[PDB]
Structure formats: C-alpha cells, structure tokens
Amino acid sequence: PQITLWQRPLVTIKIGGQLKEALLDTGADNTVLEEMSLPGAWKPKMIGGIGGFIKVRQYDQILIEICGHKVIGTVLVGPTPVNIIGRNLLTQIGCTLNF
Amino acid sequence: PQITLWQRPLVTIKIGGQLKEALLDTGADNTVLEEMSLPGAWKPKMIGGIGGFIKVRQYDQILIEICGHKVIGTVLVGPTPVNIIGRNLLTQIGCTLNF
Numbered sequence: 171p172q173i174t175l176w177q178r179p180l181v182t183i184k185i186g187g188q189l190k191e192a193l194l195d196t197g198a199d200n201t202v203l204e205e206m207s208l209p210g211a212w213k214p215k216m217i218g219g220i221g222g223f224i225k226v227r228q229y230d231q232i233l234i235e236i237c238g239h240k241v242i243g244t245v246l247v248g249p250t251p252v253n254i255i256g257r258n259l260l261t262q263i264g265c266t267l268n269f
Numbered sequence: 270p271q272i273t274l275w276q277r278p279l280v281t282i283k284i285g286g287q288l289k290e291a292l293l294d295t296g297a298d299n300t301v302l303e304e305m306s307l308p309g310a311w312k313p314k315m316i317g318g319i320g321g322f323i324k325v326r327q328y329d330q331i332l333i334e335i336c337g338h339k340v341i342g343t344v345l346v347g348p349t350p351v352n353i354i355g356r357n358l359l360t361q362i363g364c365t366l367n368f
C-alpha cells in the first residue's frame with residue numbers, strides 16, 4: 171500500500187497472539203510496545219524520547235504481523251502511550267518514504 | 270525521491286536563513302526544532318514524547334525549505350535533541366509511506 175500522512179499512520183499488528191494498533195514511525199530507531207506479556211528471555215534497556223527516558227524490556231526474535239507481512243525482530247516493551255513500529259521493523263516490510 | 274529506512278531519514282532544511290539537518294518523522298504530529306532564533310510572534314506550548322514533556326515556542330506561517338520543496342507551516346522550537354519534521358510539513362511535500 172501507499173499511506174499518506176494527513177492522519178497518523180496507524181496499522182493493525184498481531185504479536186504474541188494479540189491484536190493491537192501501532193504507529194508506523196520513521197523517526198523511531200526501535201519498536202516500542204505498551205505493557206504486554208511476551209514469553210521468553212528479556213534484557214533491561216533505557217530509551218530516550220523527546221522529554222526524557224523510559225525503562226523497557228528488550229525481547230529479541232519476536233514474530234510480528236504488520237499489515238499481513240510477517241516479520242521477526244527486536245521489540246521493546248514499556249510505558250509508551252502509543253505502540254510504535256520503528257525502523258528496525260519498517261525495513262523488514264520494505265517500507266519507504268516517497269515524495 | 271524514494272528514501273529507504275536502513276538509516277535515519279535525515280534531510281537538509283533551510284529555515285530562518287540557516288541550514289540544518291532534520292529527521293523525516295511520520296510518528297510526529299508536529300515539527301520541532303532545536304533552539305534557534307526565529308523572528309516574529311510565538312505562543313507557549315507543551316509537547317509530549319516518549320519519556321515526558323518539553324516546553325516549546327510555537328511559530329506560525331514559517332517558511333522552510335525541505336529537499337528543495339518550499340513549505341509554510343507551524344514550527345515548534347525547544348529542547349529537542351534532534352530536529353524533527355512532522356506530519357504537518359510532510360503532507361506539504363506530498364510525502365507518503367509505501368511498501
């Protein structure tokens with residue numbers, strides 16, 4: 171698909187058997203999801219946004235369905251107000267900016 | 270142009286007679302620039318990112334050159350670590366996400 175930017179670029183994702191809405195975010199290096207239970211091992215990480223830092227749990231090799239594309243990558247879980255799909259996963263769906 | 274996302278989508282902008290680098294940011298509703306002097310009237314605003322909020326100055330009807338496209342819009346100025354081009358200006362250059 172082509173997605174214009176007059177509205178937030180929100181898409182449906184499936185992760186850990188759960189359906190969620192997430193923002194396609196070219197300004198984010200990483201993918202950051204609201205608190206959820208993901209099975210398996212994780213590592214502590216801190217990430218900085220505008221306004222400061224949040225503590226997150228880093229899960230590797232996590233399967234996510236983003237607009238029907240299955241992708242595997244690192245997802246960070248913590249107190250973000252919006253689920254963010256960052257460049258680490260955007261590249262896996264061949265997502266480009268065009269103008 | 271088409272811009273892939275293996276690296277941060279940084280572009281050169283010209284604003285207030287100054288050259289800066291800024292990130293094309295589909296996850297940002299607004300455009301937020303590091304501290305700079307812009308002439309004219311402004312209004313106080315607070316903006317929330319991941320991690321918290323920052324106080325900014327809101328300038329309207331500001332001319333900015335983004336990859337040779339001249340656009341006019343609202344620019345927020347304050348303590349962001351990276352200049353951010355948000356959807357308010359991305360729409361003006363006809364920027365789309367494609368995959």
Ligand SMILES: Cc1c(O)cccc1C(=O)N[C@@H](CSc1ccccc1)[C@H](O)CN1C[C@H]2CCCC[C@H]2C[C@H]1C(=O)NC(C)(C)C
Binds near residue numbers: 218292299301319351
């Ligand atoms: C999520 C993330 C990473 O994993 C790695 C690096 C940065 C970020 C990150 O927070 N990036 C942000 C730009 S602000 C920014 C700050 C530093 C570097 C690059 C961008 C997002 O793209 C936009 N970001 C998406 C979203 C993140 C959760 C909180 C609500 C919004 C806030 C919005 C935002 O900040 N908007 C402003 C108008 C204040 C700029």
